[PDB]
Each structure stands twice: as structure tokens, then as C-alpha cells.
Design a protein around this ligand. Structure first.
Ligand SMILES: Nc1ncnc2c1ncn2[C@@H]1O[C@H](COP(=O)(O)OP(=O)(O)O)[C@@H](O)[C@H]1O
Ligand SMILES: Nc1ncnc2c1ncn2[C@@H]1O[C@H](COP(=O)(O)OP(=O)(O)O)[C@@H](O)[C@H]1O
Ligand SMILES: Nc1ncnc2c1ncn2[C@@H]1O[C@H](COP(=O)(O)OP(=O)(O)O)[C@@H](O)[C@H]1O
Ligand SMILES: [Mg+2]
Ligand SMILES: [Mg+2]
Ligand SMILES: [Mg+2]
Lengths: 149, 149, 149
């Protein structure tokens, strides 16, 4: 039984030119790329993305930092929502575990490279916000017999 | 004092073609390759290898998943039995620590890439099961003065 | 607000020829090289470097193992003193967390690849010990906007 999560490379991931390295970390576990799109995030879409943080003092600066090129992604795998969060590490890179993306690449929460859905509910909502359905691709990995039980 | 452990790349490690990456992780710590052999594991030898799991519900499926090409290895180093187990990570990849082999490469316990001895007694037994003594090679690493105290 | 820490590649890092890999780990987080110098450490400077261990049993052997080529480094970043210590891992490689330098490269405390300042006071002292002020270089990373909040 697999699930899908929404992962987004933030503008610092694009500008520091580590997109391929990020993707390789998820491919290495046999997670399937179900969707991938480069766009430029705008305030209106970012306000919906970060709707839970509406009204807060730190939202305007977050929206400014996120206004930039992003790579929207959907990955599929066993427990991939929680696992992708674990692989990203803590929001604050200084608290993130060695070997996580944020610990290996970053210094501060405001420039922490990547976003990942925090729950099944947020994954459904975020995939619907950033992708049209035709952009979610269904296919099977040829190495499935060696990735799954 | 150094010891020797038995490490085996399972058929998923062969088929996903990550043998070299696995070997490099152990070489990186200055662990010495003392033996290495590609074979195809058969139920009879696997039954002896996994004798501690006799009767357990997962054993028949484990033997099936392990019937395939494997790379038998012996590595030598300080505390290498416990250390290699730490590098492998937990049986479940989802529970394994970031930076371990199972967390970095795998999703599920039944396809978790690598076996390693869990104790001095099991290392002795497993090395003897899979290797004849003439297959164990003794040499000294040229960088020994910079690896060992 | 950034700070500067003193990092030193020990003779085993030089001789095992992993200098570039070590530097890449710190560059990967956007830490800035503020100073760098290859020298051959002498007992006199090592006595002052390791003054806190004066009288201790392992000191003379530590000085001996450290009498050789070293790479003196100063790296700048947010919380970089504590963060570089986290990235190095525990003194004993066998106790260091997976994904740290010492866990990924080493076996024993006497050959654990790298030194890093352990506090703000020690970083100031160690930088001044190994570098003259003229050797410390001030410049801005062009990716600063994508590294720092
Ligand atoms: N105190 C803070 N200072 C700067 N940026 C923050 C702070 N808190 C959150 N952020 C930013 O907002 C993003 C979304 O917030 P949140 O959902 O709490 O974290 P995460 O993305 O780890 O789930 C974070 O990834 C981070 O970039
Ligand atoms: N509940 C399970 N489901 C699927 N596979 C399992 C399960 N328990 C064990 N296994 C498989 O059997 C192998 C041997 O089990 P065990 O010796 O307990 O683990 P380890 O290899 O971590 O020492 C594991 O590496 C794993 O591939
Ligand atoms: N018990 C020990 N055995 C061998 N070498 C040691 C031991 N303790 C310390 N050392 C060596 O002395 C160095 C300095 O010791 P210390 O300052 O306590 O560790 P660290 O470098 O982790 O801060 C260590 O990096 C290590 O090379
Ligand atoms: Mg969030
Ligand atoms: Mg076992
Ligand atoms: Mg110290």
C-alpha cells in the first residue's frame, strides 16, 4: 500500500542549483516520480498553500522568500508522507538530524530548501492546489519486485 | 584489536545495482575487505544462515526473497560487527536513522538490501557457513598508521 | 548574525586524501571559507592548542600523532561553532551519529580526522593561534540571499 506526498523545492534549492541532488535522494529509496513541474510561485497561490499561517507576523516574509521559481513534485512510496518529512529533517536546520536534507544543505528555517506535506490531508490539498490532474502520471517502476515486500 | 564480520548484499542490492556504493561505505572507514564472493543463495544454505528464525511467520517469504544472487563479504575493523550493524540501520528502513544504508536506499523490511552479523558468535558461524578458510585473505592496509591508534 | 570557527584537518585526513570531501561538507551548507592554510604542525604549537589537556595521560601521544601536515581552516556561518561540532560527530567514531564525519570516515578516537573549536572562547583563541589577522579574508557569498534569512 503506497501513498503520495507533495514535495516542493523552494527558490533557494533552484538558485543554489541542487535540484538534481534533492531528486536523487528520493529516487535512491525507490520512490516514484508521479508528477514534476517547474513554475514560479506567486503570492496568491502561496497564500493558499500557507493558509494555516494566515494573519501571522512571519507570513509576509515567508511569502516574499517563496516568490520565485519552485519545483513542484509528487513522490509515491510506502509511508512516503512521513518518510519524506523525516528525510527533510526539522524545520530549523540546526536542529535537523545529520543526513537529512536541511542539516546537510542549510543554516536557517527561512531558507530550508524544500517543503513536504505534513499529513494525508495536507498532501491531498497541496497536490490539488499545485497540480492539475492530467499532470499526475500513473506508471509502475520496473524494480518494484526489489523495492516492495 | 580488530574483528571480522559477515556482510551479505541481498538480491535487491544486486538487482538495483548498488553493490559498489555499499562497498564504498565500508571502505570509507578504512575497513578491510578480507573476503568477497558472488554466489546464488539457495534455500538449503539460507535455512542454515537464518536458523535462528526457524518457525517464524516471515521465514518462508524471507527464504524466497533471498533465493537469488548475493555478494558474500567479510570486513575487518575495530568493533566492526556492531559498527556495521549501526551503519546498516534498523530492520525496518522506515525506522532506520538517516545516513544508514537501509534508510538511504530502502522502504520495507522485506527488501532491506543487506545482512550483517549481529554478534561475535554469529559472525564466526556465518563466515564459516559461506566461506572456506582458504578464501579469507590476510593483508595489511597501507594506511594502517592513519586508521588505527 | 554569523560567527567563525577553527577547523583543522589532522594528518590522517591529509594522508587518506579526503581533504576535498571534508571541505565539500562545509561548503554544502553555505559556510564561507574565511581562512585556509596547509602547514606542518609542531609540538610547540600543539602544546598550546591542546593546553586544556596538559598533564593528561594521552597528551604526549596526541601531540605525536598530530605532528605532521594539517589543513588549518576558518569557516563562517550561523551557529557554525556548534554546528561544525555536530557535523564532526563524537570524539569516538564508534559513538558518533551516522552521517557525521567521524562516523562516516573513522574507527578510533586517536585517528578521527578533524578538529573543531568547541565554544566561542575556544574558537577565538584557536583562530588567533593558527592565523594572523591578515590571513582572515572578508568577502560576501553571492548566494547569501538564498542562504540566510
Ligand atoms: N520562525 C521562523 N523563522 C523563519 N522562517 C520560518 C519560521 N517558522 C517557519 N518558517 C518557514 O515557513 C515554512 C513553513 O512553516 P512550517 O510548516 O512550520 O515548517 P515546515 O516547512 O518544516 O513544515 C518553513 O519550512 C520555513 O521555511
Ligand atoms: N516482519 C517482517 N516483515 C518482512 N520481512 C522481515 C520481517 N522481519 C524480518 N524480516 C526480514 O528478515 C531478515 C532477518 O530478520 P532479522 O535477523 O530480525 O533482521 P536483521 O537483518 O535486521 O538482523 C531482515 O533483515 C528482513 O529482511
Ligand atoms: N580516549 C582517547 N583515546 C585516544 N585518543 C583520544 C582520546 N581522547 C581524546 N583523544 C584525542 O585527543 C583529541 C582531543 O581530545 P578532545 O578535545 O577530548 O576531543 P575532540 O577533538 O572531540 O574535542 C581527540 O580529537 C582525539 O584525537
Ligand atoms: Mg508545513
Ligand atoms: Mg539478523
Ligand atoms: Mg577538543
Amino acid at each position: 500500500h503506497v501513498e503520495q506526498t507533495y514535495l516542493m523545492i523552494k527558490p533557494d534549492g533552484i538558485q543554489r542549483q541542487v535540484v538534481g541532488e534533492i531528486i536523487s535522494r528520493f529516487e535512491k529509496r525507490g520512490y516514484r516520480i508521479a508528477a514534476m513541474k517547474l513554475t514560479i510561485a506567486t503570492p496568491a497561490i502561496l497564500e493558499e498553500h500557507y493558509a494555516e499561517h494566515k494573519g501571522k507576523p512571519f507570513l509576509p516574509g515567508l511569502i516574499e522568500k517563496m516568490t520565485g521559481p519552485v519545483l513542484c513534485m509528487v513522490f509515491e512510496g510506502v509511508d512516503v508522507i512521513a518518510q519524506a518529512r523525516k528525510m527533510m529533517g526539522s524545520t530549523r536546520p540546526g536542529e535537523a538530524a545529520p543526513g537529512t536534507i536541511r542539516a546537510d544543505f542549510c543554516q536557517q528555517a527561512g531558507r530550508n530548501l524544500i517543503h513536504g506535506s505534513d499529513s494525508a490531508e495536507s498532501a491531498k490539498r497541496e497536490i490539488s492546489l499545485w497540480f492539475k490532474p492530467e499532470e499526475i502520471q500513473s506508471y509502475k517502476l520496473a524494480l518494484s519486485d526489489y523495492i516492495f515486500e
